[PDB]
Design an enzyme around this catalytic site. Structure first.
Site, mmCIF file in Angstrom:
data_model
loop_
_atom_site.group_PDB
_atom_site.id
_atom_site.type_symbol
_atom_site.label_atom_id
_atom_site.label_comp_id
_atom_site.label_asym_id
_atom_site.label_seq_id
_atom_site.Cartn_x
_atom_site.Cartn_y
_atom_site.Cartn_z
ATOM 1 N N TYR A 312 -0.694 -8.457 5.903
ATOM 2 C CA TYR A 312 -0.252 -9.126 4.656
ATOM 3 C C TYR A 312 -0.963 -8.491 3.455
ATOM 4 O O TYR A 312 -0.322 -8.257 2.432
ATOM 5 C CB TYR A 312 -0.558 -10.615 4.709
ATOM 6 C CG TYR A 312 0.322 -11.421 5.623
ATOM 7 C CD1 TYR A 312 1.658 -11.611 5.317
ATOM 8 C CD2 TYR A 312 -0.182 -12.023 6.766
ATOM 9 C CE1 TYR A 312 2.484 -12.355 6.137
ATOM 10 C CE2 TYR A 312 0.630 -12.777 7.593
ATOM 11 C CZ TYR A 312 1.965 -12.948 7.272
ATOM 12 O OH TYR A 312 2.796 -13.678 8.064
ATOM 13 N N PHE A 315 0.756 -5.384 2.534
ATOM 14 C CA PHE A 315 2.036 -5.755 1.874
ATOM 15 C C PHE A 315 1.789 -6.087 0.402
ATOM 16 O O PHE A 315 2.610 -5.737 -0.416
ATOM 17 C CB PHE A 315 2.694 -6.966 2.533
ATOM 18 C CG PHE A 315 3.348 -6.690 3.856
ATOM 19 C CD1 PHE A 315 3.236 -5.447 4.464
ATOM 20 C CD2 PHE A 315 4.029 -7.695 4.517
ATOM 21 C CE1 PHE A 315 3.821 -5.202 5.696
ATOM 22 C CE2 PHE A 315 4.617 -7.449 5.746
ATOM 23 C CZ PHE A 315 4.509 -6.204 6.336
ATOM 24 N N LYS A 321 6.406 -4.115 -6.702
ATOM 25 C CA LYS A 321 7.589 -4.676 -6.000
ATOM 26 C C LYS A 321 7.672 -6.169 -6.352
ATOM 27 O O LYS A 321 8.800 -6.673 -6.530
ATOM 28 C CB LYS A 321 7.557 -4.339 -4.500
ATOM 29 C CG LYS A 321 6.667 -5.207 -3.619
ATOM 30 C CD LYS A 321 6.888 -4.977 -2.133
ATOM 31 C CE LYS A 321 5.593 -4.949 -1.345
ATOM 32 N NZ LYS A 321 4.649 -3.919 -1.857
ATOM 33 N N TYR A 322 6.532 -6.843 -6.517
ATOM 34 C CA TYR A 322 6.497 -8.296 -6.817
ATOM 35 C C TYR A 322 6.854 -8.498 -8.295
ATOM 36 O O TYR A 322 7.607 -9.447 -8.604
ATOM 37 C CB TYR A 322 5.164 -8.894 -6.354
ATOM 38 C CG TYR A 322 4.944 -8.766 -4.864
ATOM 39 C CD1 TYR A 322 5.740 -9.459 -3.969
ATOM 40 C CD2 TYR A 322 3.991 -7.906 -4.345
ATOM 41 C CE1 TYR A 322 5.559 -9.353 -2.602
ATOM 42 C CE2 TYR A 322 3.810 -7.768 -2.980
ATOM 43 C CZ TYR A 322 4.596 -8.499 -2.102
ATOM 44 O OH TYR A 322 4.444 -8.372 -0.749
ATOM 45 N N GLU A 380 7.011 -20.921 5.962
ATOM 46 C CA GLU A 380 6.259 -19.879 6.699
ATOM 47 C C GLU A 380 6.053 -20.358 8.132
ATOM 48 O O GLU A 380 5.412 -21.428 8.316
ATOM 49 C CB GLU A 380 4.926 -19.596 6.001
ATOM 50 C CG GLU A 380 4.101 -18.535 6.705
ATOM 51 C CD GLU A 380 4.901 -17.302 7.085
ATOM 52 O OE1 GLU A 380 5.216 -16.469 6.179
ATOM 53 O OE2 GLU A 380 5.250 -17.202 8.282
ATOM 54 N N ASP A 407 9.920 -22.551 11.030
ATOM 55 C CA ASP A 407 11.001 -21.547 11.078
ATOM 56 C C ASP A 407 12.129 -22.029 10.157
ATOM 57 O O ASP A 407 12.577 -23.187 10.335
ATOM 58 C CB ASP A 407 11.504 -21.353 12.502
ATOM 59 C CG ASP A 407 12.385 -20.126 12.625
ATOM 60 O OD1 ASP A 407 13.391 -20.038 11.865
ATOM 61 O OD2 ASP A 407 12.044 -19.247 13.445
ATOM 62 N N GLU A 423 11.209 -11.820 1.515
ATOM 63 C CA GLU A 423 10.848 -10.392 1.745
ATOM 64 C C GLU A 423 10.841 -10.174 3.258
ATOM 65 O O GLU A 423 9.785 -9.835 3.839
ATOM 66 C CB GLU A 423 9.529 -9.983 1.073
ATOM 67 C CG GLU A 423 8.323 -10.876 1.360
ATOM 68 C CD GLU A 423 6.988 -10.383 0.788
ATOM 69 O OE1 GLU A 423 6.017 -11.203 0.743
ATOM 70 O OE2 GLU A 423 6.894 -9.167 0.404
ATOM 71 N N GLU A 432 14.151 -6.324 10.611
ATOM 72 C CA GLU A 432 13.321 -7.530 10.866
ATOM 73 C C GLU A 432 14.234 -8.749 11.041
ATOM 74 O O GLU A 432 13.718 -9.789 11.370
ATOM 75 C CB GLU A 432 12.280 -7.721 9.763
ATOM 76 C CG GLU A 432 11.309 -6.562 9.649
ATOM 77 C CD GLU A 432 10.288 -6.638 8.523
ATOM 78 O OE1 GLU A 432 10.182 -7.717 7.885
ATOM 79 O OE2 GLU A 432 9.599 -5.617 8.274
HETATM 80 C C1 MTA Z 1 5.888 -11.746 4.039
HETATM 81 S S1 MTA Z 1 6.567 -10.787 5.353
HETATM 82 C C2 MTA Z 1 7.861 -11.835 5.976
HETATM 83 C C3 MTA Z 1 7.372 -13.244 6.330
HETATM 84 O O1 MTA Z 1 8.427 -14.110 6.759
HETATM 85 C C4 MTA Z 1 7.953 -14.924 7.833
HETATM 86 N N1 MTA Z 1 9.142 -15.236 8.621
HETATM 87 C C5 MTA Z 1 9.944 -14.344 9.230
HETATM 88 N N2 MTA Z 1 10.975 -14.960 9.849
HETATM 89 C C6 MTA Z 1 10.826 -16.251 9.604
HETATM 90 C C7 MTA Z 1 11.582 -17.433 9.949
HETATM 91 N N3 MTA Z 1 12.693 -17.329 10.687
HETATM 92 N N4 MTA Z 1 11.105 -18.605 9.515
HETATM 93 C C8 MTA Z 1 9.979 -18.695 8.763
HETATM 94 N N5 MTA Z 1 9.251 -17.630 8.384
HETATM 95 C C9 MTA Z 1 9.637 -16.423 8.778
HETATM 96 C C10 MTA Z 1 6.954 -14.063 8.577
HETATM 97 O O2 MTA Z 1 5.990 -14.827 9.335
HETATM 98 C C11 MTA Z 1 6.348 -13.224 7.453
HETATM 99 O O3 MTA Z 1 5.135 -13.760 6.903
#
Ligand code: MTA
Lengths: 625, 310
Positions: A312, A315, A321-322, A380, A407, A423, A432
């Site tokens: 992180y 990143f 980028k931000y 997150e 999720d 992102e 991803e």
């Molecule tokens: C900041 S990099 C992308 C971020 O999204 C989060 N992420 C990816 N997929 C999901 C999801 N389906 N639900 C919640 N967070 C996610 C990852 O844990 C990561 O920190």
């Protein structure tokens, strides 16, 4: 500065010679391990029973010196491909002998010539030496840009030089190299000593060597011009090649006698250093891309995996980028809250994959910038990153930000969103699974809601790199398919490579996705026109995304966002390299394939020849849902 | 042993050249062991050679001696491993050998030297693929020719024409040169490309005929005029390193090979004599000016052999 050695074919005392070249500032010496004239007989009496020694003693230098300062050289009488059978056999015997001595001595490298087209038996013998103990020492194959026959003065009355243009012919020297390395099955121990002449060939001829393992450049004193002060110097076109070769970090070798006699051989080396320190400078990005050149990395899967603190941190390390994200939200906010409704109207902004909060902070800076009101949700799934978030929100953000540990596909939100920001993109955009994640979240976006980003597109380009082909090949692991290396993508700062064609769009996604039935599966056919002779080794991948309207991010070289050069592209290997003749089209086919469980890519080349389909049913590589 | 003369002659005997008076010029290299150098020796008594103590004059060269030639009676022109062509001059008393000049013009080992018919010019050949023409008096390079595409094996000046010399290379070319032609070189060879040409000798009297040896031990007699490959014999089991004509009115031809053998051939290329005397590579031959039936061979076995030819 510059790593450089001295090439000599006369060493009366190895002691004084080495000492001399040190005083002249050379890092190392290329020299014969047996006297170049001392031809040896192995089969016929009486010369076979020649009393020894057969050369000078190891005891004449430290093991360290032999290990670091000395590159050995094959004696020039050694002709393993000779049409004369007795010469072929004595040359087989002598070559083994001299190679065995360099191994005896612990030499870091050994020089062998490719000075003609047929080096089959020479390769067969070298392969034998390589397959006799596992040793690290490099073999530098001395090849000229221009074959001697095509360099010769037009001074033969009844053998005129063919002044006619010869596209393929002018490239004959690369084919010498290709055939040798292919016979020796791409041994990592075999690299190129590229020998440069006074007359450079066509740029097409130089381009032939782009992706090749060049360890050394040989500059004859011959090719050097003279300035008014009588200093040795080089043509601008020679100088351009040096600047090209410095990027590949080769070792420069000075061969031939001193032609600038007033001045010492420091003169030649002085010049190279002068070019080095005074080279068209690079960028911070090239400093960002510091030690990662052709370093293969597993693509991060931040969905299936929970990223580490320092992942992180990296990143976050590129602010630009931000600032772009801040700008997209700022713009979207003004388009949604009229200046009359600023204080009545508070938008629900949800960061979907909030990591350690950089988009949360950018969302906040954007709202204060727009002078408009936002409620924030920080969603997150990585509970380790939720720890960072919840400390931030307690200490700084306060109740404006509701951190959600969930999720985004499972989360039951208390209210629908005006704007979702994310992102969730990789070097190949959808790699991803941003598509699947945002699809799962869109049911909680208002019917007029905005996703930032609204769109992203993957791009592909065919590339040549014998270097990276070998890098991948070397990634065999026990207890899996011996060829799985080739059936998976790698993130990598592609460095020693040739891009054979302009990038073409591959897959595109749009958010929200209005399709009544939604299929994130893809099948795309691309045609890459190729204007050079080359070998295809794989496909470079890049992406572009529209955050909002005109605000974008790209790693595609033609459209590359500024500051985002720490974000490397992706590589899709192929198992068998594919010869491509100038004017031929490379046709590649890509699928994005899915289960409930896994998303993957499969790919094939259909032209100018057919590959096998790579990664069928995710056998070698999948991305976790 | 003389003043300026070393105690020990290097083992590998490269060249043997009799002067008009019958004095013997010796070139030697150190091709193995710690120090890889060479030496120039003068033996007014040829039978004492190779013994260093019984030498008229001797000197040490910085590097090995690939080739040698007499320049008149007091001059010695040297092909050095160093890429230098060096001029060495005999003493008035001829008791020591002094370097007149040493020029590092070749980018690799100087393999071959010949003096042109004037004696004021020489041609050098090198592993660097270049052939150079030398102003001996001004000690400079008049011309440098990259005619060949591989290492130059032999260069042999015409007996009587100061503009004419042969060259052979591992590019499988025999080149006939004339510096009077704006394109000075001309490719001369039999209908079939054959085995690499290794050795060259002009006929002493017939200014338009030469002989060449190959890497397969074949000796060939060539007429520029007919441009036909007239006569060829399989004289050696290995490479023909050298070809030397007798001083006779109808000359005999000495043939020396890596097969460690010497042969002497008639003008028809038939074999009169054969010596297995050497037990290593046979490097040179010079017929005695004094007795034309006497022939001295030198080898890497450090043997100086004196042959009586039938
Ligand atoms: C900041 S990099 C992308 C971020 O999204 C989060 N992420 C990816 N997929 C999901 C999801 N389906 N639900 C919640 N967070 C996610 C990852 O844990 C990561 O920190």
């Amino acid at each position: 500065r510059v790593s450089s050695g001295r090439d000599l074919n006369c060493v009366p005392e190895i002691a004084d010679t080495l000492g001399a070249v040190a005083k002249q500032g050379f890092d190392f010496l290329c020299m014969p391990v047996f006297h170049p004239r001392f031809k040896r007989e192995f089969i016929q009496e009486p010369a076979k029973n020649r009393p020894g020694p057969q050369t000078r003693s190891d005891l004449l230098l430290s093991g360290r010196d032999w290990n670091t300062l000395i590159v050995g050289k094959l004696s020039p009488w050694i002709r393993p491909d000779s049409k004369v059978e007795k010469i072929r056999r004595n040359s087989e015997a002598a070559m083994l002998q001299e190679l065995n001595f360099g191994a005896y001595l612990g030499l870091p490298a050994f020089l062998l010539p490719l000075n003609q087209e047929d080096n089959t038996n020479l390769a067969r013998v070298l392969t034998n030496h390589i397959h006799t103990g596992h040793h690290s020492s490099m073999f530098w194959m001395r090849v000229p840009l221009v074959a001697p026959e095509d360099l010769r003065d037009d001074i033969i009355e009844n053998a005129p030089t063919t002044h006619t243009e010869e596209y393929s012919g002018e490239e004959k020297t690369w084919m010498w190299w290709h055939n040798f390395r292919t016979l020796c099955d791409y041994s990592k121990r075999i690299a190129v000593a590229l020998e440069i002449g006074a007359d450079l060939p066509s740029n097409h001829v130089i381009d032939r060597w782009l992706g090749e393992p060049i360890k050394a450049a040989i500059l004859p004193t011959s090719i050097f011009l003279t300035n008014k002060k009588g200093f040795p110097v080089l043509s601008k076109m020679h100088q351009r090649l040096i600047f090209r070769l410095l990027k590949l970090e080769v070792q420069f070798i000075i061969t031939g006698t001193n032609h600038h006699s007033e001045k010492e051989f420091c003169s030649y080396l002085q010049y190279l250093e002068y070019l080095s320190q005074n080279r068209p400078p690079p960028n911070a990005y090239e400093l960002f891309a510091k030690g990662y050149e052709d370093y293969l990395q597993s693509p991060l899967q931040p969905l299936m995996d929970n990223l580490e603190s320092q992942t992180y941190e990296v990143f976050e390390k590129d602010p630009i980028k931000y600032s772009q994200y801040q700008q997209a939200i700022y713009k979207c906010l003004l388009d949604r809250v009229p200046e009359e409704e600023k204080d009545t109207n508070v938008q629900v902004l949800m960061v979907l994959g909030a990591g350690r909060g950089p988009l949360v902070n950018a969302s906040l800076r954007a709202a204060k910038q727009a002078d408009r009101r936002i409620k924030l949700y920080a969603v997150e799934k990585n509970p380790n990153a939720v720890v960072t978030l919840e400390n931030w929100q307690f200490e700084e953000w306060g109740s404006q930000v509701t951190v959600v540990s969930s999720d985004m596909r499972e989360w039951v939100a208390p209210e629908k969103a005006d704007i979702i920001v994310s992102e969730l993109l990789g070097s190949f955009a959808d790699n991803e699974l941003s598509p699947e994640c945002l699809d799962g979240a869109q049911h909680f976006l208002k019917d007029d809601g905005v996703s930032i980003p609204g769109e992203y597109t993957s791009f592909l380009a065919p590339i040549s790199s014998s270097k990276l082909y070998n890098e991948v090949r070397a990634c065999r692991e026990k207890d899996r398919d011996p060829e799985a290396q080739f059936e998976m993508p790698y993130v990598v700062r592609l460095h020693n490579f040739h891009q054979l064609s302009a990038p073409q769009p591959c897959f595109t996604f749009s958010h929200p996705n209005r399709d009544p039935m939604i299929d994130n599966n893809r099948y795309c056919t691309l045609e890459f026109p190729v204007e050079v002779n080359t070998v295809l080794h794989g496909f470079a991948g890049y992406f572009e995304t529209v955050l909002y309207q005109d605000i974008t991010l790209s790693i595609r070289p033609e459209t590359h966002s500024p500051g985002m050069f720490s974000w490397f592209p992706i590589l899709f290997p192929i198992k068998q390299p594919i010869t491509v003749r100038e004017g031929q089209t490379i046709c590649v086919r890509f699928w994005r394939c899915s289960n409930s469980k896994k998303v993957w890519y499969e790919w094939a080349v259909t032209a100018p020849v057919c590959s096998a389909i790579h990664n069928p049913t995710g056998r070698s590589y999948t991305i976790g849902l | 042993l003389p003043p300026n003369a070393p105690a020990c002659m290097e083992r590998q005997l490269e060249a043997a050249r009799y002067r008009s008076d019958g004095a013997l010029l010796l070139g030697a290299s150190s091709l193995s062991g710690r120090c890889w150098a060479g030496s120039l020796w003068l033996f007014k008594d040829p039978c004492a050679a190779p013994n260093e103590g019984f030498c008229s004059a001797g000197v040490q060269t910085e590097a090995g001696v690939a080739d040698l030639t007499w320049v008149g009676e007091r001059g010695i022109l040297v092909a050095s491993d160093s890429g230098a062509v060096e001029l060495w001059e005999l003493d008035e008393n001829e008791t020591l050998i002094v370097s007149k000049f040493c020029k590092y013009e070749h980018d690799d080992i100087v393999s071959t030297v010949s003096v042109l018919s004037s004696g004021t010019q020489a041609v050098s050949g090198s592993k660097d693929i270049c052939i150079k023409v030398w102003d001996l008096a001004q000690q400079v390079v008049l011309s440098s020719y990259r005619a060949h595409a591989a290492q130059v094996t032999c260069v042999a000046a015409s007996p009587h024409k100061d503009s004419v010399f042969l060259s052979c290379s591992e590019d499988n070319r025999i080149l006939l040169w004339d510096t009077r032609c704006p394109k000075p070189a001309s490719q001369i060879g039999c209908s079939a490309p054959g085995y690499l040409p290794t050795s060259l000798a002009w006929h002493p009297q017939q200014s338009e005929v030469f002989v060449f040896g190959d890497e397969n031990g074949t000796v060939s007699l060539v007429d520029t005029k007919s441009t036909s490959c007239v006569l060829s014999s399989a004289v050696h089991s290995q490479c023909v390193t050298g070809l030397v004509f007798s001083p006779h009115s109808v000359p005999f031809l000495a043939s020396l090979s890596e097969d460690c053998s010497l042969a002497v051939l008639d003008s028809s290329l038939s074999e009169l004599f054969r010596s297995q005397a050497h037990r290593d590579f046979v490097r040179d031959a010079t017929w005695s000016p004094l007795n034309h039936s006497l022939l001295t061979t030198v080898g890497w076995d450090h043997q100086v052999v004196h042959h009586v030819v039938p």
